Amino acid sequence: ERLLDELTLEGVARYMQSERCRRVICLVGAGISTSAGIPDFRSPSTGLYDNLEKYHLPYPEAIFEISYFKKHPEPFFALAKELYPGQFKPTICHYFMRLLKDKGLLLRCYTQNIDTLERIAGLEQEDLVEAHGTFYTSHCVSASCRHEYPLSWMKEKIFSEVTPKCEDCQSLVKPDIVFFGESLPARFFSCMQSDFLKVDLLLVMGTSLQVQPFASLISKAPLSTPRLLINKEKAGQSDPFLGGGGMDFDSKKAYRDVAWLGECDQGCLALAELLGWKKELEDLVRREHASIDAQS
Numbered sequence: 588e589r590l591l592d593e594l595t596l597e598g599v600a601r602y603m604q605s606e607r608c609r610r611v612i613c614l615v616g617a618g619i620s621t622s623a624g625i626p627d628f629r630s631p632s633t634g635l636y637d638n639l640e641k642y643h644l645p646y647p648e649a650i651f652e653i654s655y656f657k658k659h660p661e662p663f664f665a666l667a668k669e670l671y672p673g674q675f676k677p678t679i680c681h682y683f684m685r686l687l688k689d690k691g692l693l694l695r696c697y698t699q700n701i702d703t704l705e706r707i708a709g710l711e712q713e714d715l716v717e718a719h720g721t722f723y724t725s726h727c728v729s730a731s732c733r734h735e736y737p738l739s740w741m742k743e744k745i746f747s748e749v750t751p752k753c754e755d756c757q758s759l760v761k762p763d764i765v766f767f768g769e770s771l772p773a774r775f776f777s778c779m780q781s782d783f784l785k786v787d788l789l790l791v792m793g794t795s796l797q798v799q800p801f802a803s804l805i806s807k808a809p810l811s812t813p814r815l816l817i818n819k820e821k822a823g824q825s826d827p828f829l830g831g832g833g834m835d836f837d838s839k840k841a842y843r844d845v846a847w848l849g850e851c852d853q854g855c856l857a858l859a860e861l862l863g864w865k866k867e868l869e870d871l872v873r874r875e876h877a878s879i880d881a882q883s
């Protein structure tokens with residue numbers, strides 16, 4: 588009695604073009620931005636922790652902690668300059684979600700990424716739940732002030748190596764990324780409680796589903812909702828060592844979860860092609876990439 592006629596990408600595409608599939612939630616992570624040249628800073632294999640040197644951190648994780656930032660912001664802002672991407676060109680995967688938006692299918696995109704590429708690709712703040720915050724805006728950290736600053740202002744401070752301070756009150760100005768010791772954006776749980784009542788398809792792209800709050804979203808889907816994972820590696824299965832709601836791709840009881848294992852851009856391209864959207868997607872990506880490349 589399942590909604591997918593077969594547990595494959597072709598099955599998902601037929602479901603998407605059926606009357607039953609109207610609202611798509613995307614869950615996306617660092618794997619949709621690596622092909623844009625932005626490494627996964629949460630991966631230990633990236634080497635963030637060996638890069639930290641002259642910063643006499645009481646513990647390597649201090650550079651992610653809010654209380655350390657507020658007393659000693661200089662290490663963070665030096666790391667931000669070192670890690671600042673050289674260009675912001677969203678991927679095929681980002682523009683695929685813009686197509687979902689254009690066609691009225693996008694309920695929400697939940698993202699673990701801070702790189703703003705979802706917004707550059709044309710998702711609006713209403714479309715987005717940035718589970719780890721974003722560099723897109725910054726705020727003065729004084730509770731009585733909270734003056735907002737755009738990324739252009741923050742970029743200029745970061746590159747000139749001037750610690751950003753509020754023009755109204757001279758407190759520090761912090762990018763709206765969620766540091767250790769900061770609470771999750773309240774919109775995360777509000778949107779989660781409402782969105783998963785309405786979802787017809789969960790599209791999971793470029794995330795290992797290991798880090799909170801993402802490590803629990805797939806269990807919020809209704810039991811019937813198909814869940815497509817487009818990812819280099821299988822993810823989201825129950826961990827046998829910790830004793831549900833996990834991905835079941837391959838058992839005889841599997842009925843709704845599909846894994847497409849490969850590069851995220853190639854999987855999204857394959858899905859768009861099945862849907863008849865390949866020309867639309869190519870035209871959009873090439874136009875937006877050309878526009879970004881021509882920035883003067």
Ligand SMILES: COCCn1cc(COc2cccc(Cc3cnc(NC(=O)CSc4nc(C)cc(C)n4)s3)c2)nn1
Pocket residue numbers: 625628629650651652666667668670671672701702703719720722723738764765766767
């Ligand atoms: C380990 O996880 C702990 C949990 N946690 C916390 C968070 C939220 O994020 C952070 C919170 C605190 C500290 C950092 C360190 C970084 C600073 N800058 C980084 N930049 C990138 O990596 C490339 S994107 C980019 N885009 C723009 C527009 C500008 C720039 C500079 N960079 S990383 C991240 N997420 N997960």
Ligand SMILES: [Cl-]
Pocket residue numbers: 616794795796797798801
């Ligand atoms: Cl993760």
Ligand SMILES: [Zn+2]
Pocket residue numbers: 727728729732733734753754755756757758
């Ligand atoms: Zn201020």
